[PDB]
Design a protein around this ligand. Structure first.
Ligand SMILES: Nc1nc2c(ncn2[C@@H]2O[C@H](COP(=O)(O)OP(=O)(O)O)[C@@H](O)[C@H]2O)c(=O)[nH]1
Ligand SMILES: [Mg+2]
Length: 167
């Protein structure tokens, strides 16, 4: 493979993080080789193993990660309000250069929506994050979130924003 990246999927317990991973590959981790611009990027995506339901997430989970999905549940504002803390954790325990794509998950549960597309998209813009709404149940935008994250990493490598020899 031309690139090897450790990826996270972070956010509140119950937001669909493990289902996003399972949808993307098919669980402690998963790996999948994706083609971006004729280059194979091998992703090793670490699952939190439910630890965030019970305690702080171990810092060894974040360490060395190049990219992350930051996930909230569109039906739960409480998960949405938690995003800054997860993002700060990602940037402190992984690195300030982790590429993070915001995912409003459970898009298929639009009737019971509590977070608007537009307030979430403003959050992303304000925080230098790409944004998509996703469903792990149907699969809508799941592959694309992972692809967008990987694609952004390679663009920043290409433009000299990210030093690939330090990743
Ligand atoms: N309706 C719907 N349910 C989802 C979606 N993603 C996850 N879930 C459900 O939400 C619950 C928790 O998902 P899980 O992957 O374990 O979330 P995690 O704790 O953040 O890893 C499960 O009952 C899932 O089936 C989705 O996109 N739509
Ligand atoms: Mg999980």
């Amino acid at each position: 493979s031309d690139f090897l990246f450790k990826f996270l999927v972070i956010g509140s317990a119950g937001t669909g993080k493990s289902c996003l991973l399972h949808q993307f590959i098919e669980v402690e981790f998963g790996s999948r080789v994706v083609n971006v611009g004729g280059k194979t990027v091998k992703l090793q995506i670490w699952d939190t193993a439910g630890q965030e339901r019970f305690r702080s997430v171990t810092r060894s989970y974040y360490r060395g990660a190049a990219g992350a999905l930051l996930v909230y549940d569109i039906t739960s504002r409480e998960t949405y309000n938690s995003l800054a803390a997860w993002l700060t954790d990602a940037r402190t325990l992984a690195s300030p250069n982790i590429v993070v794509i915001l995912c409003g998950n459970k898009k298929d549960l639009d009737p019971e929506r509590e977070v608007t597309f537009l307030e979430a998209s403003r959050f992303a813009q304000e925080n230098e994050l790409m944004f998509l709404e996703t469903s792990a149940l149907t699969g809508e935008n799941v592959e694309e979130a992972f692809l967008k994250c990987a694609r952004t990493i390679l663009n920043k490598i290409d433009s000299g924003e990210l030093d690939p020899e330090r990743m």
